[PDB]
């Protein structure tokens, strides 16, 4: 019904972006506004910064809040509460984020890219992955869909975490502290049983503002909240279940999309960089441009290597391997994980990653779509 | 029931403030954080600013949003839609904000205070005015209350406007423009019939951010929105009616209170300024310290001068003049209108206005309370 409406609207952003980006009439204002350093000083203290770094810390924070909510749900209730319903998806994604890496990473065990591999081709655009799956009538899913979504999250929410520890936390003494009192309140606040979901959010924005010098952390704050916001319907109704529902549209329609309008506008012109000019390029491109469609050859080795005692779940047999193909469209999710990898550090090869995780993305969005149309 | 709970909680802020303010142990951190200039520069542009100026633009903006909502309601539906139900309250407040002035103003037709009079003793703490009225069982009101609230708003929302025109609008070309497109969207947005009240707010924050160089304007934005947010229950339900209801608690419990914690902390110590040291002082104090309890001697001349063809409304006769006494507690509302008057302009005599509109306030909060306890 409306589940597909998003895919169409979302894909519109990415395009609108390119247009804006290479337009020449807009390529100016666009790139201009986005970035832009600048210094300041409030009394006897000075500093500087740029743009875009806000928009993403804001957007992925909200986005991951919802992700936080859902992962809790699936963990405490549905699709993953039991170490029996979990075992597959976990084993399915714990693979889903080690083959892509250990393909791309081992494709680039060189230098300022070693950090790139570690992730980029891990995240799957959980928004697009279910989008292309919805354009398919309605037969086969309803247990297939609720499955895919276990990877995307685990793999995405995974990366974000692996990456939070990998980084030498800019433990700004103070902040790291505030983050603690705030993160503490969140707890006592849930303990004493507060369901006024308004509160939780504000504390969160505090926590968010605290850890605001490291993107991946501000992102994680979202998750941290979506984790504390009450779930047990004890009240008579669930505050989380409500929130997760009002947020759903907004993220899929405003956020996700909006976020894609800021990051997907990759400039190809200037240096049109013909065919092989892309693939040819070191892993940074081919590596992650393949770590994705060749990132399926993981479930079909990790999800299949589950001929030991782990049930499919009223699935559709070998029709699961077509799912692992769609988890090859890290689209925005990667684009994000890509900015995390570079963005502030050597960011000129970021316009490459974007291309790579855009080509490899589309060239796995249909090379995995059609295959799953003839199945029924 | 809970209508009084606020009064008790609110009054707690004002006190907590003083304590903090004159504490010596906190009087430091307090005054310190609040204020604080600071310069900046994003590229080739530099500037500076201070604190507190944010908190109030944020708080009174939200507060006046709700006020906006209600005034629309009463105007388009209840207590004031008809030029028959209006006539009294209007005539009651149009007086309620011209006698206080023309008492205080004519008490101070001197110099950098001429601007002060024009308002300060006009606003009535519509939150406190109904608070002291609720501590009184439940007999007599239910038509008296719904009346008082017509002044407070008209008088308050009045001042804010009179003051927006009186000021030589810092028509920052650009901003003044954005404010227009935004304020325009708000319209087409209501025209095409959008009830997704989420939108309206965001546009608002844009509009708010636009006119952000003149407090009184950012404040007005709130009102401007609460004005466009759809009212007709055509939908089946009203988006405004809902909003106005979720906001109610928050403003009366978090906002209003919070706002009072930032502005009511008047320092009396240092210069304890004995008795007459206060009253004695030019109008700035006595003038507005009296323009308030002697601001009743207005209805009882303007609301009573309504022996021409304007009905009371199932009221309680001379028991209306006790209402006009409570509209002598501009408390926070004045404190706010006081910061507007001074705050950025000659602000050392602002700690006076605070005192004056605090004394005259309490000395009209009981000298008007008791009188209305023996009535029943």
């Amino acid at each position: 019904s409306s589940d597909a409406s998003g895919g169409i609207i979302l894909i519109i952003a990415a395009i609108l972006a390119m247009i804006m980006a290479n337009s020449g009439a807009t390529s100016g204002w666009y790139h201009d506004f986005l970035e832009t350093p600048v210094q300041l000083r409030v009394g006897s203290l000075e500093i500087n910064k740029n743009m875009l770094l806000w928009i993403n810390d804001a957007l992925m924070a909200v986005f991951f809040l919802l992700v936080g909510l859902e992962v809790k749900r699936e963990l405490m209730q549905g699709s993953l509460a039991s170490l029996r319903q979990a075992a597959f998806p976990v084993i399915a994604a714990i693979g889903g984020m080690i083959v892509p890496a250990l393909l791309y990473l081992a494709f680039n065990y060189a230098d300022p890219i070693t950090r790139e591999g570690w992730a980029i081709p891990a995240a799957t655009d959980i928004a697009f992955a279910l989008g292309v799956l919805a354009l398919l009538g309605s037969r086969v899913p309803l247990a297939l869909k609720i499955f895919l979504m276990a990877l995307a999250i685990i793999d995405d929410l995974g990366a974000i975490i692996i990456i939070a520890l990998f980084y030498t936390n800019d433990l700004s003494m103070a902040s790291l502290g505030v983050a603690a009192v705030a993160i503490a309140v969140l707890a006592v606040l849930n303990l004493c049983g507060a369901r006024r979901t308004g509160v939780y959010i504000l504390v969160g924005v505090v926590l968010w503002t605290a850890v605001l010098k490291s993107g991946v952390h501000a992102t994680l704050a979202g998750v941290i909240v979506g984790f504390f916001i009450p779930l047990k319907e004890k009240h008579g109704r669930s505050p989380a279940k409500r929130l997760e529902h009002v947020l759903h549209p907004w993220v899929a329609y405003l956020i996700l999309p909006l976020f894609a309008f800021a990051n997907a506008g990759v400039s190809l012109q200037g240096v049109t960089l013909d065919g092989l000019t892309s693939i040819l390029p070191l892993g940074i491109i081919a590596g992650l441009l393949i770590g994705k469609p060749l990132g399926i050859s993981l479930f079909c080795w990790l999800a299949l290597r589950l001929k030991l005692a782990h049930l499919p779940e009223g699935t559709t047999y070998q029709q699961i391997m077509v799912v692992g193909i769609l988890c090859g469209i890290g689209f925005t999710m990667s684009i994000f994980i890509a900015s995390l990898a570079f963005g502030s550090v050597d960011p000129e090869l970021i316009n490459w990653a974007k291309l790579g995780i855009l080509v490899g993305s589309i060239s796995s969005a249909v090379i995995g779509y059609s295959w799953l149309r003839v199945r029924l």
Side-chain angles (χ1 to χ4, degrees), chain A:
Chain A
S1 306
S2 283
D3 302 305
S5 212
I8 265 26
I9 193 137
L10 175 77
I11 195 41
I12 288 184
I15 263 58
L16 242 288
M18 319 264 233
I19 292 179
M20 283 292 266
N22 317 74
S23 158
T26 69
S27 166
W29 183 84
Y30 183 88
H31 285 107
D32 213 308
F33 156 79
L34 226 49
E35 43 147 276
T36 207
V38 63
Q39 122 174 330
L40 188 147
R41 158 216 282 170
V42 63
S44 319
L45 51 181
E46 346 176 77
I47 339 162
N48 309 50
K49 321 235 137 186
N50 329 261
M51 252 78 225
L52 197 194
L53 217 294
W54 278 114
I55 299 182
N56 289 188
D57 292 348
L59 299 189
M60 285 303 109
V62 164
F63 171 84
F64 265 89
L65 155 55
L66 178 153
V67 177
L69 287 178
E70 172 72 5
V71 77
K72 182 189 196 173
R73 199 211 72 183
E74 302 186 305
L75 220 190
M76 248 57 259
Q77 306 211 319
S79 330
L80 181 160
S82 54
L83 300 71
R84 158 191 49 151
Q85 301 179 70
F88 190 30
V90 174
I91 293 294
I94 181 165
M97 183 204 82
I98 180 174
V99 161
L102 229 59
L103 166 159
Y104 176 56
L105 179 64
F107 194 138
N108 294 175
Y109 59 129
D111 214 332
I113 33 274
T114 287
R115 298 305 167 177
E116 121 261 289
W118 209 326
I120 291 192
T124 64
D125 203 309
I126 167 180
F128 203 30
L130 309 186
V132 81
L133 186 61
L135 289 169
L136 296 176
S138 70
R139 194 68 183 77
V140 175
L142 294 312
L144 188 285
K145 292 183 175 182
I146 206 172
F147 162 63
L148 159 49
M149 177 175 266
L151 298 176
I153 295 185
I154 274 292
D155 268 351
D156 295 0
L157 203 157
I160 266 58
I161 293 174
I162 286 81
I163 300 184
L165 295 324
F166 120 157
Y167 167 57
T168 306
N169 28 288
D170 210 311
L171 41 73
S172 182
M173 203 59 237
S175 285
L176 231 301
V178 172
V181 341
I183 199 173
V185 156
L186 284 182
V188 338
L189 198 58
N190 144 121
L191 200 55
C192 305
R195 57 171 168 69
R196 194 62 190 67
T197 183
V199 178
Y200 290 77
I201 252 52
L202 292 184
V203 182
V205 27
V206 139
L207 161 60
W208 177 87
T209 298
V211 317
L212 200 46
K213 191 153 191 171
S214 178
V216 59
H217 285 67
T219 300
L220 269 185
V223 178
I224 286 283
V225 195
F227 258 55
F228 280 26
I229 301 172
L231 177 67
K232 269 266 183 290
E233 189 177 302
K234 170 60 186 177
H235 314 285
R237 178 73 75 178
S238 186
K241 186 160 70 74
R242 171 212 138 177
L243 175 63
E244 160 148 36
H245 218 81
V246 192
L247 212 63
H248 198 304
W250 291 88
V251 295
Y253 286 46
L254 190 63
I255 309 298
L256 228 304
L258 230 167
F259 163 73
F261 173 65
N263 308 86
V266 49
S267 173
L268 28 64
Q269 290 284 57
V271 174
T272 301
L273 36 94
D274 286 316
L276 249 67
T277 314
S278 160
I279 298 181
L280 166 72
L282 181 279
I284 205 299
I285 284 296
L288 102 195
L289 201 174
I290 219 168
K292 289 185 57 192
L294 274 294
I296 313 166
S297 162
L298 166 171
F299 314 105
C300 307
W301 185 288
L302 271 289
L304 220 293
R305 175 256 199 179
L306 298 185
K307 192 82 100 300
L308 300 184
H310 319 294
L311 293 63
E313 303 277 300
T315 59
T316 52
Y317 303 0
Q318 305 184 308
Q319 185 167 178
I320 201 65
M321 77 167 275
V322 187
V323 176
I325 298 179
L326 300 171
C327 293
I329 65 175
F331 196 18
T332 71
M333 272 316 300
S334 293
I335 288 185
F336 173 61
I337 300 294
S339 73
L340 284 170
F342 308 118
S344 268
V345 193
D346 202 346
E348 301 96 298
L349 48 69
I350 196 167
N351 177 282
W352 273 114
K354 232 84 73 61
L355 279 173
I357 72 177
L358 198 53
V359 155
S361 195
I362 322 171
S363 291
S364 188
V366 288
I367 279 62
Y369 162 52
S370 59
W371 179 312
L372 206 168
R373 187 191 189 186
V374 295
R375 297 267 68 181
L376 198 60

